[PDB]
Amino acid sequence: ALPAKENEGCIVSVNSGKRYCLPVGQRSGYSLPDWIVGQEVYVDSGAKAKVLLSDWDNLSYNRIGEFVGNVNPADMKKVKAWNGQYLDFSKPRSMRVVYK
């Protein structure tokens, strides 16, 4: 609902519109909170921020995709990951926000 501030990155549940946000410089717990984990999301990253997602817990095994701006889940299904594969980040389980 509320747009990400400049130094924040958010994912937003497609089902509920509830937002999960982190300031630049922070990461999630081992898993995202129970109220969002593994739900389908869109990305809403603030103007100075980049959202890093994993389809696994704990930002693990280089299973990490990069997202800037506003990204819809349909565009998150075959994304080049740090591990060299094209992964589906539309239902992420962990997250980090950095400066773009």
Binding site: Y30, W56, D57, N58, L59, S60, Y61, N62
Partner: peptide
Amino acid sequence: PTTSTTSAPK
């Protein structure tokens, strides 16, 4: 090497 990992279910 210095990648994060997960635990199998416990």
